Structure 1
Amino acid sequence: KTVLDANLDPLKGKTIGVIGYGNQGRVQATIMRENGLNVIVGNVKDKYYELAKKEGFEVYEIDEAVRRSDVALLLIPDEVMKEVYEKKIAPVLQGKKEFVLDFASGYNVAFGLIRPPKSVDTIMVAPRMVGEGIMDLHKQGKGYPVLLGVKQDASGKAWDYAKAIAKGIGAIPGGIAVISSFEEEALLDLMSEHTWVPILFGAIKACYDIAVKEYGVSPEAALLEFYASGELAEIARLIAEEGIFNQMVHHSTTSQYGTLTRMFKYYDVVRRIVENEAKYIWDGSFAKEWSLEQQAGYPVFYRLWELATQSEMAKAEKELYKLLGR
C-alpha cells in the first residue's frame, strides 16, 4: 500500500536543473550528483553563488537554467516563490513543449497561488527531516520518509516520474514513500504550527504566572522545573523510538496515574480547538489572512515579537541563562 522501491530509468541522460541553493537545495543536489545525473545549479547572484561553484557545480541564472533543463526542482522558500515565478519561470514555460515541474512544499499550488499551464507535469516530493540531519545520514546508507503527490496529469508517466526522484535523492530504498495529495500535504504541515505547538508554549507560560504570582514560588526555581532543565528533550527522544504510550513505564507510578486520568478528562476541550483550526485552513481563509499581512507591511507580526520577548517569563530566563553559562 506504500512504496518501497522504484527505478531510475525514466530520468537518465537528461538535464536536472535545481533552482535555489539554500538549505534544501544543497542536500538534494549532492546526493543526485553521486547517483550520476546531469545536475546544474540555477541561483540568484548572491553569496551562495561562490559557495556552489567551489563545491563542484556549474552555476547559471534562473531563467537560463530552465531553458537547458527538462526536469526542474523549485527548492526556494515559499515567501519569495510567487514573485520570482511570474517574473522568471512563467515566460519560459510557454516556450517549452513538455516539462516536469517539482515542488518541495504544497502551499502555493494547493491554494492556487501558482497555476502552471496544461502542457506541464506538476509533482511533489516532500522530505520529513530538516536537512542538517540528512547529510549526516547519507554516509550511513539509510533513508528517510517522503510524501508523493501529482496535481496535473499530462504524460501518463506522471506517477512514475515521482517515484524515481524519491529513489534519486536517497530516500528509498531503506525508507517509506507514502502516496498523498497536494492538499493533504499543506493541511498536515499547518496543523502542527496552529494546534499543538501554541497550546504547548501557552501552557508553560501559564504555569509560570500561576506559580509565581499566586503561590510565592521563586522566579529562579519555577524555571528549572518547567523548561530550563532538559527533561522535555529527554522524554521526547523516547517517543521517536519506543512509542508514545510505551515510554510511560520508565516513570513513577504516581506519574502515570496523573497523566492518564487527566488526558481523558481534557480530551474534548482540546478537541474543539482542533476542529476549528482545521476548518479555517481547508476553506482557504488562513491563506488570505497571511497574504494581507505581507501587504500591510507586517504591523501585527512586529507588535507580537515585542510583547513576547519583553515579558515576565522571558526577562527572568535571560538572567538564569546568564548564570549557568549558556
Structure 2
Amino acid sequence: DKTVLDANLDPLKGKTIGVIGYGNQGRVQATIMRENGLNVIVGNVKDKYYELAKKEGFEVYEIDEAVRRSDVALLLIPDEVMKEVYEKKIAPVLQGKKEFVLDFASGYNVAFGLIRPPKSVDTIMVAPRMVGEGIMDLHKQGKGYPVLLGVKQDASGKAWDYAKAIAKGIGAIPGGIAVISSFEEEALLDLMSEHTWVPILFGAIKACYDIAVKEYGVSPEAALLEFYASGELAEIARLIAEEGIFNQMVHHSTTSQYGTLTRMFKYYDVVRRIVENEAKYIWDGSFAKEWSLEQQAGYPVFYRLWELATQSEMAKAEKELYKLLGRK
C-alpha cells in the first residue's frame, strides 16, 4: 500500500527549524518537536500569542528574522491571511536563501496558485487530521495519529525524506500512519465535506423542524429535543468512529435499521448528483475565485446569511429552550 508507518529522523538533525505562527497547530507541534530533540525557534507578530510563546521557553524573533536563521519553516497560520504575510515578509528573505524546505498544513493556497515559491525550495505538505486540541490528549499516551503528505516541488531529491522526518518530529508516527498524497487531494477533500454533507445535514434538520411545526401542529419545544437538542447525534458519531459506520446500526431497533437502509438506497443518486457538481466546481478553481472576490467586496453575503440563520425561528426557539434546560 501507500501507507507509511515509521521512517527515519536524521535529515532534521543538525538543521534549525522555524515555526511560523503560534496558534493551535503551532503551539502543539512546536512543543512536540522540542520534546523529540530538535532546536526550534518561533516566529510571530507581537501580541498575546507572543507572550505565551516566549513564556513556554521558545526564543522568538520577528517572522523574517526567523526565516533567516532557519533551514526549514512551518507556516502554521490561517489560510485567509497567509498570502499577504508571504508576499510582504517571507518571499523577499526567501529570495535571499539557498537550500530551503517549506512545509504547509493546508494546500489551498498552493494548489490554486495563490502562493508560488521559487525553484530553489522544496515545497512539501504535512497535514494533520485533528482538531488540534486532542493531539495532546493522544500524545501523552504515546499514541500517534494520521497525517497526509505531499510534495509540490523537489529541488533536492530528498523532499519525501524530509516530509517523513517532519511527520515523525510532530509525533504523528509511529503509532499512527502517514498517507502520501497531493496538495490537490487535500484541499479537495477538506472542501468537499464543508460543501456536501455538513450543509445538507443542517438543512435537513431545519426542514424537519419547519415541516413538523408548520404542517403537523407540533410544539417547538418538542421537535428540538428529537432532532438535535438531545445528545443522540454525538453518540451515533462516536459509535461510527469506533465500531464502524454500518456495524454501528446493530445497537438500534430493526424498525430503524429497515427504514434507514431503504431510504438510504432510495435517495442515493439525488445526493451523488450534488456531490459531483460541487467537486467539479472545486477542482476547476472556481470556489477560490468566489471566496477571494467576496473577501475583496467586504463580506456582504457572509454578513446577511449569518443574520438570516441566527434570526430564524428554529434559532429563537433553541435559545428559549437552552435558556430553560440550564445549558448555557
Q: TM-score, normalised by structure 2?
A: 0.99
Q: Secondary structure at the match of 2:74?
A: strand
Structure 1 CA distance, aligned partners of 2:45 and 2:274? 42
| Structure 2 equivalent of residue 28 of structure 1 | 29
**Deviation digits for residues 33-60 of structure 1 (CA, Å, limit 9, x no counterpart):** 1111110010101111111111111011
Off by >2 Å, runs of 4+ in structure 1? none
Structure 1 CA distance, aligned partners of 2:66 and 2:144? 29
| Structure 1 equivalent of residue 103 of structure 2 | 102
**Deviation digits for residues 38-83 of structure 1 (CA, Å, limit 9, x no counterpart):** 1001010111111111111101100000000001110011011000
Q: Secondary structure at the match of 2:122?
A: strand
Alignment of 1:203-222 (within 5 A): 203-222=204-223
**Deviation digits for residues 69-127 of structure 1 (CA, Å, limit 9, x no counterpart):** 00111001101100010000010111111100000001000000000001100000000
Q: For structure 2, which runs of at least 5 residues remain unmatched after alignment?
A: none
Shift of residue 181 of structure 1?
A: 0.3
Structure 2 CA distance, aligned partners of 1:169 and 1:214? 54
**Deviation digits for residues 137-196 of structure 1 (CA, Å, limit 9, x no counterpart):** 111001100000000010001111101111111000101110100110100000000000
Structure 1 CA distance, aligned partners of 2:137 and 2:218? 43
- Number of residue equivalences: 326
| Structure 1 equivalent of residue 19 of structure 2 | 18
Shift of residue 315 of structure 1?
A: 0.4
**Deviation digits for residues 240-263 of structure 1 (CA, Å, limit 9, x no counterpart):** 111111011111111111001110
**Deviation digits for residues 270-320 of structure 1 (CA, Å, limit 9, x no counterpart):** 111001000000000000000000000111100001100001100000000
Q: Secondary structure at the match of 1:264?
A: helix
Q: For structure 1, which runs of at least 5 residues remain unmatched after alignment?
A: none
User: RMSD over aligned Cα, in angstroms?
Assistant: 0.6
Structure 1 CA distance, aligned partners of 2:14 and 2:256? 60
Identity %: 100
Structure 2 CA distance, aligned partners of 1:296 and 1:12? 47
Structure 2 CA distance, aligned partners of 1:158 and 1:271? 37
